[model samples]
Target: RPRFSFSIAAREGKARTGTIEMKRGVIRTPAFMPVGTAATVKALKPETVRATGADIILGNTYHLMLRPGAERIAKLGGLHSFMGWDRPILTDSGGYQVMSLSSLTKQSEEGVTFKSHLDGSRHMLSPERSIEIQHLLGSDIVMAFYECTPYPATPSRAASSMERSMRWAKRSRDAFDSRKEQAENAALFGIQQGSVFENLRQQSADALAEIGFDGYAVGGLAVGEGQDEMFRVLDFSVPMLPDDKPHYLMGVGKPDDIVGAVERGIDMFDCVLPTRSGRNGQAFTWDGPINIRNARFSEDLKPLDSECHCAVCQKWSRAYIHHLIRAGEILGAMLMTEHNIAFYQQLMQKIRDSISEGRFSQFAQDFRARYF
Candidate 1:
């Protein structure tokens, strides 16, 4: 068997249902990977995350490198053993966080330098160093280090940023190839960066295709672009990458966004929304997102979603969760997060089922009607 293999099982319109097989595990496509930023999915345990039906999780190279450090993680037995996950993990190149969260930023042909948000410590992340760090952390799907061009950029700015990212992609690939053992064990994904310009996006896609990657990610989106603009980019960008490779949309979305993206042909996704919203007293349901702290839910006596069969939904009532959130209890966040994560996984399962059954268009229409 190949180190990594992706095969499409079915397709409806542009949407596809498939599987990505890796040594760690098999990920069902139209899949949602929960964000395990610091080796933990916040208040949820590894078992809890896995119980939600997540085949893979995302680790932030920036956060881990700042705290326990990648070298330390490798010393302790890689992120999977360290976190007790034992599933596939996709680690970002540490460039996005370095650009967004770090201070005193400076960029050049080599890389970017900045001060850590946690400790004000200094660091620089070059393409080579980013790949090395990901290798140290044992990332199953490693992202190439590239600048995530900020949204609303000028035409010239977008062009230059994308051109630079293509160069970084080559460096990242060369570095990954240097570690023969790790290279054979993992898959490298090159990101396409162009903000929202179609011309630039085409250039970015062609450059990455020439260098090649095991997978491709539609990057520089979901930054601040509303759903319409993000979808517009996806309409053009998703088709630019190879049909065989798994298409990953990084840091994406609410339930509706996932549905739409699937319809646009994206297969894999990761986002902090569910966990972050849960911590903020939000629970996602088939109808829409609901704030558990709402006054009316104080006396309501139903699960977050009656259609759901997750553990939290099976036993907990809205009133109880409401009270927990109202009291600022830690259990509130835990329960909410558990429910939301499960809901996302269930949503992905439904998407896959719909595509395989040849009714994805109807599913998407019904989903949007209920969600929005």
Candidate 2:
């Protein structure tokens, strides 16, 4: 087994603070990874991204391979050099995009084939190809290719998909191991998929355990299954995986969702909410979420949030931001995105502090009371 060192520094209930030491860098547990889907965290520079205290960011193998092409990036000096982000990068295996974007995607025992949403070209993505793409992009952590079973799926359908994903997990592992570069440097995480069923989740966990991985991700939730159901699944699924390895929750959501997942022992997470919402004029703050597009903010002289230490909050007022947003100025998006990223980083810092001090339960409750 490949060695990974994870140490739990402190704990409060299920919420815990820890560290994951990898060749690239150390990731603080219960960490929120900012989404850099297209090799960039929209509207923010790489320096600003680092200044926000992000230990890692996510890259989409599906999107990058579709646009810039993985081989092109490797020729240019890999994704980190290509994007000017030196920190650890986790690449998704393109499975989600197969279901979400590609038209006429067909799943077989080997892999998935679909028409490209970009140029109408046909492409096949298998465990081998997925890991190859991630390796080509020079990812520090690569997710195993697994089917993302949609919400409201029948039990039988979910079971078949989960079982297939387990099989694919083995193929992904084999493929990853075959790559000398990947096997020596990057970590491969197996995703647990079973829709919302506990039995299926347990089965997936057991199968992945048998296969083994550098880490485990609780996948297939947060796809419109609602928070209650997502929490219910995590309540049962998280404990099934090995405690020593990192636990990742994929595509997880809002502030409340992160708090709940951390409470359920999730160690890492990524989502587009902060950046996407920022682009839409939504700013997340310690107090609550505020929409600058609201007309009532036309004359408000207050900062986006008094508690925020971001550059935007320190310099821009709600009224000014509202005017810029209404007028469609580019600065509006930039400022909002910067503030949102800073807000998320600050939230992660708070969570880590609380967990280390054994106050995570109370901190989470207070945070939920205000944010949710």
Candidate 3:
């Protein structure tokens, strides 16, 4: 079996500094995995991505399964070799994508049946199929197939969805159990869902704990609920999870949002903000976020971020990047994506350092004062 282990090196309040050791690599806790949808991180090469200090990266099952198809990837030698990224990769169950992308989607106890947003083809996803897809893709970490209930759902509706997800969690676990190769190589995570209801959250946690998983994720937040509410959920929801396993907050957000979540005992996070925002000409920096498309950067001779030491920042200036962006040059996206990913990795490093030094609370305060 693929051995997994976690060791807490330090702790400050609820915040912690730790390392997760897997066969692929070691992931520092409170770590952020840059989203590498479609087999690439937009503009960065695998080595360049690693230079940014990222221990792991996230892949989207929905996008990859639709485009290249998981079977093709497995034939090509799995996601790691195909994508040139040897580090650990965590893949979502494609549940969220089915909910968001498919125009005609029907959710039943069996699974979700929907028409493909890309080609209008019909397909269905169940616990068995989801695990099979993740296996074909050679995911190091697999997420349980769970319904992503939207915020503001009625208690009854939320409870029903949560219960179904818990049931699916069992099926997903059983299917994974039957796959000797997957069970030996990949780690499965159970997602806790309940919208914003505290009792429902606890119930979902209990159900997932009963099923057991290598890790746990706090799902169904950050869809539309603001940070305050999300944090409130984390406040109670995190402690309810097994402290021995890593706690992942999925599709989580901006730099400040990450800082706050980490403060609440979250250990792993994945988001597309840095990559997506970079493509849109928005750059995240230590001080705050900046729009490279703005006219104010036209004469700015400084780099993207004075503190960032990434290749893009070391080699290019704000004026040149601004010119490229204004001229609609593709290099703009490349440079911005590189810097933004670096910024996120740098932030993760800072968080880890703070926790290890027993100064996370002060670090968070300082980060909030500047970034927020």
Candidate 4:
């Protein structure tokens, strides 16, 4: 089996261009994975999503385990065959989902006992169980199970949470390593959780690095922390991870936010902004985000983003998208989503090119001046 690894091909300042090698396929960085919350990227089919230039997609363990049942999917030929996507899939360890079910669940040191929001079905998710399910789904990348500490938490509270997450990280590491074949074929990534507390961030990093992983992720930001505050935490949190490994930023955000994190040294990202906003008639563009549902767009004949090279822009006009959205048609969502994903991928390509050419700082200045 081919072992999982990350290699930086080029770098300019903290921004880097690299690749992640795995048995299934290789992923280019810094990459943006579209969120496939329930084994689907909402409006777009898997092939269509792939065409938009995504190297990977993120699956929600909480949602998948709850409805389809991991065991059932395994029997049917894993998530790849079931979802009809053949590249790579990264699954969150279900901790984020359990935390979101705050009103319908209880958590302890061992695990979480939660009621599903879909049907109030009861379920238990421990670190071992999380790893087991990811294996069943045949995930290319898996995250270590850890709690997402809310923003504005006191230092003591964050410390307590971080410590518990460290214990869970140990459990997740052991569970991941136990399956020897899985370890060889797939990549496991540890998550850093400190809720903006620098010391706690260091502690979490130390504990995770001790356990080790094919990659490391900076989590617990973008929950409610503004861009500046999120950047502040990343300033302290990012360098703590190993320099040789890929660094993932989870549940992260807008185009500007992604650009900011790249400069801080992150190598991977997943977000729902493009797909979700597209469904709501919003299109991200070179200048900024614009609402296609606005009255003014109803008569405008321009492409969604004239600077964009996506098929959506080549074939359709904003007036047509506006008409469909106004009529509540599904095609609007599909076209808009296609455009947004293309926009992100093209931006990432530009960023990588800038980094390779050692002009990333210049690229950032020009990009922000126009987009922000």
Candidate 5:
């Protein structure tokens, strides 16, 4: 039917502005989704996350299924009500986690079999199971189950991994469609694997395009690939996918990484760096990221960023946060975390405006120059 749509609004160079119309909310593209892994965005309240200009937030199927249990969440009235967030929630298929939680897993053609890091409970998550978990979680956007190829893989290994992932993509689609109502309202994103191999990426893209989906994600990049190589992969991989759909780059990075990816035509991203770094006393600023726990800021009475419009930067002093963090206080993490989240949203706003104005290049150049 006419539900679940993504359309281009503007374009500059290779970058394009778009929108994802969802049942719960509308997500503006070239967007940044804050990680709310396991049902929360850590220190901030759901309303606080919304106030930061976020249109969507991400959830992890691996963690959620293990902790509260997907069936429990479904019975408790789905993640939206369970977490107190009404906006769109995109759930990763647990593929990345399976890869990262490598020691706990044994991979086979069917799917991944693993033991829980929490309690040593054995479990299996296949393509069907991942989709079922996301479905049960009431995910607005669900990712296809695929092996995230490890870096430094040989061409033959990459090809083998990518082909297997393509096979799983079909299974993921079939599983999602099995839940007719959920498939119609919710959307699935096919991930492009192939780990830096152009031809293999094309093959992967061709396979997914044939199966079709609501969107596409360029995966396997931020695993360990450097900035230059990552961009090099995007140069070939991104354009191969259907341009009419949203293009997401998974687990992407710092402020500069976001900017660079946007320029290369990536429309969406998620990361834990902002909140994780904030907890570690680091804050993202217009000039770049800075550690609030630095001894130099022990008595400095300036805002985190003189240019930031976030409330934390508006009223709180770096010295205050510094004292709070150094003293090992929880509020320190909360305030810095809030500011960083707002900072990311603000940056995304800037990116969209720049693209729409046909001046994204000038914007990127200026950002790097100032940040560096």
Candidate 6:
């Protein structure tokens, strides 16, 4: 089987519905990958995640590498076996989190050195080291190591950051190429890192395409830039990359953001909003988000979402969930998370169907009308 391959089956405007065939399984696009920060999707089990229509999940190299240690995970037979997950797991390069999560971070052309957020230990993560960590975890889709350029930067600062990321991307490619055994079973994706400049974006995309990867991610976005600016960047950045390969928008966002990104040709996405919100008594529905812990839900004998058919929604009532959430019960988190996961998946399926039926634009319009 091919290490990785993407096939586009339908298109509506810039949006496309497709599948990414990998050794572990096939991921449908525009796919919303739930983030498994510490080898776990928080409160949900692996079967529940799969039942929610997730073909793959995202693993964090920074969290895993620091917590269990990549070497230990490899010794225990890779992250999949360790976590009871058999489907594809895409791991970040630990670059973004190193800067964002860790303290006393030092960045150079070589890489980043920082203090561990979990412990006081000092650590260094270069492109080569990042690739090695992902290899150890047996990541199906390995992301390249690149500096996450901060938002609200001058043109000169953004250019410098993007240039350094391009250099790191080359190093990341070299490191992944060196691992023959791992390389044969997995695919590497390069990240484009221009903050918001079209010219810088073009340059970053061209550099990544030249180095080549199984896919390309639009990075340095969703980092506090409002949806409009993010969409503006996607407008120009999406077309710059190689279209035949999968296009991923990193760390993207709300349900509406996912829809907007998919509309702009992004085929893959990962975010913590749904599951994170679920744990805090927030749930997503066709009518927008609602807080289950609210006093109003205490007497409401309705499912989380009237339209949802997930197990949680099919049986549990808002009154029960509200009580559990208010009391800080663990089951409340699980049930809430399961419903949100299913909701996101349902939305994705609707997107795919709309594209297939050539009614995505109208579908999006209708979605906004009800959701907003």
lDDT by residue (tens digit), candidate 1, 131-235: 998998999999999986887898899999999999999999999999997789999999998999999999999999999999999999998989999999999
lDDT score, candidate 3, position 321: 94
Scored against the true structure, residue 188 in model 2 reaches a CA lDDT of: 95
Model 4 lDDT per residue over 234-255, tens place: 8878889999999999988699
Model 1 steric clash total: 0
Candidate 2 structure, TM-score to reference: 0.97
Candidate ranking (lDDT, best to worst): 6, 1, 5, 3, 2, 4
**Model 6, span 1-372: residue lDDT tens:** 567989999998899999999888999998989999999998999999999999999999999888899999999999999999999999989888898889899988899899998788649899999999999999999999988778798899999999999999999999999999778999999999889999999999999999999999999999888999999999999999998999999889699999999999999989998899999999999999999999999999989999998999989999999999999999999999999999999999999999989999999999999999
**Where does model 3 exceed 4 Å of error?**
none
lDDT of 3: 0.90
Give the 10-residue window scoring lowest on summed lDDT in candidate 1. Answer: 116-125
RMSD of 2: 1.6
| Residue 277 error, candidate 3, Å | 0.4
Please tell me which predicted candidate would have the highest lDDT against the true structure. 6
Model 3, 203: alpha-carbon shift in Å?
Answer: 0.6
Native-vs-model 4 lDDT?
Answer: 0.89
Residues 91-149 of candidate 5: C-alpha lDDT, one tens digit per residue: 99998887676356888999988888768763888999999989999999999999868
Pairs in clash, predicted candidate 6: none
Q: Determine which window of 10 residues in candidate 4 has minimal summed lDDT.
A: 97-106
Prediction-by-prediction clash tally: 0, 0, 0, 0, 0, 0
Q: What range of 10 consecutive residues in model 6 has the weakest lDDT sum? A: 117-126
Model 3, position 361, has a per-residue lDDT of 91
Error of 6 at 222 (Å): 0.7
Residue 182 Cα positional deviation in candidate 2, in Å, after optimal superposition: 0.9
CA lDDT of every candidate: 0.92, 0.90, 0.90, 0.89, 0.91, 0.93
Candidate 3 residue lDDT tens string, 1-372: 235778888888888889988889988988899998899988889998998889999998888888899889999999999999999999989999999988789999999998888786548889999999999999999898988798789999999999999999999999998999899878999999999999999999998998899999999989898999999999999998998888999999788889999989899988889989988899988789999889999999999999898988898989999889888888898899889989998898899998999888998899888876
